Design a protein around this ligand. Structure first.
Ligand SMILES: Cc1ccccc1S(=O)(=O)NC(=O)Nc1ccc(S(N)(=O)=O)nc1
Ligand SMILES: [Zn+2]
Length: 257
């Protein structure tokens, strides 16, 4: 039932998912002047050398690039995290226009899109169990701005025509997520939630300060995807972002001065 339209969008989600008005919902605005530098935060450890991508799926609200998460092949460690978090999938949120699309904002600034690399804590055995824990997930959030092309993104862009509509998937092996990372791993971190239903409060958010640049042509191809299934009326997959939620009793920490 839920989606991003006028009648099923973020402002309606609380009726099926009351945690939508919870105490640690995501995304949030990152007020850069109020975020506190935490010198005890460690460098982030992004170890994607052994990543095994498998498939790309249009799920009706975004597209997921899925990875083999049955071994420690692509893991996130360090930073605010205790233990080891395995990469399971990544996806993006984006706008109908370059001036919006990101979920997190920075001093109220909206980026054209936001990449989420979703990882689960191996102490909980699988993703389904992890989402039931307050430290179950670590999502690495990376802002996209429109400028120069991101070469490492192009393989993703070029397969999208084969998964235009909801429920379509395509083989997507040997994709290297390292090609989507910015130079710096400076980050902000805070406790939050899944940003789509079921909106579970299981995420340590790690949002990188440095955006990546993608080309206008690259984001335009995102906007050619469909929310609908094949044979249903075409509704472009755009503006699949949840707006900033109240920070409430939370402090955003920065890894950098
Ligand atoms: C629930 C859940 C639990 C177990 C297995 C699958 C699923 S799910 O696929 O139905 N839902 C999600 O994975 N939700 C999800 C994932 C990531 C994000 S986020 N915060 O990166 O945008 N939001 C929601
Ligand atoms: Zn997301």
């Amino acid at each position: 039932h839920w989606g991003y339209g006028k009648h099923n969008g973020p402002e309606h989600w609380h009726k099926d998912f009351p945690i939508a008005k919870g105490e640690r919902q995501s995304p949030v605005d990152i007020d850069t002047h109020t975020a506190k530098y935490d010198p005890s935060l460690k460098p982030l450890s992004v170890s994607y050398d052994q990543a095994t991508s498998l498939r790309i799926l249009n799920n009706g609200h975004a597209f997921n690039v899925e990875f083999d998460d049955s071994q420690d092949k692509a893991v996130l460690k360090g930073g605010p995290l205790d233990g080891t978090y395995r990469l399971i999938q990544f996806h993006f949120h984006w706008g109908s226009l370059d001036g919006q699309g990101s979920e997190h904002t920075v001093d109220k600034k909206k980026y054209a899109a936001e990449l989420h690399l979703v990882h689960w804590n191996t102490k909980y055995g699988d993703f389904g169990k992890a989402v039931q824990q307050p430290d179950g997930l670590a999502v690495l959030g990376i802002f996209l701005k429109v400028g120069s092309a991101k070469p490492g993104l192009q393989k993703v862009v070029d397969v999208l025509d084969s998964i235009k509509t909801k429920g379509k998937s395509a083989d997507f092996t040997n994709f290297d997520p390292r090609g989507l990372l910015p130079e710096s791993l400076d980050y902000w971190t805070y406790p939050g939630s899944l940003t789509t239903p079921p909106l579970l409060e299981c995420v340590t958010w790690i949002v990188l300060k440095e955006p990546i640049s993608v080309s206008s042509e690259q984001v335009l191809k995102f906007r050619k995807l469909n929310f609908n299934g094949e044979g249903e009326p075409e509704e472009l997959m755009v503006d699949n972002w949840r707006p900033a939620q109240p920070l409430k009793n939370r402090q955003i920490k920065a890894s950098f001065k």
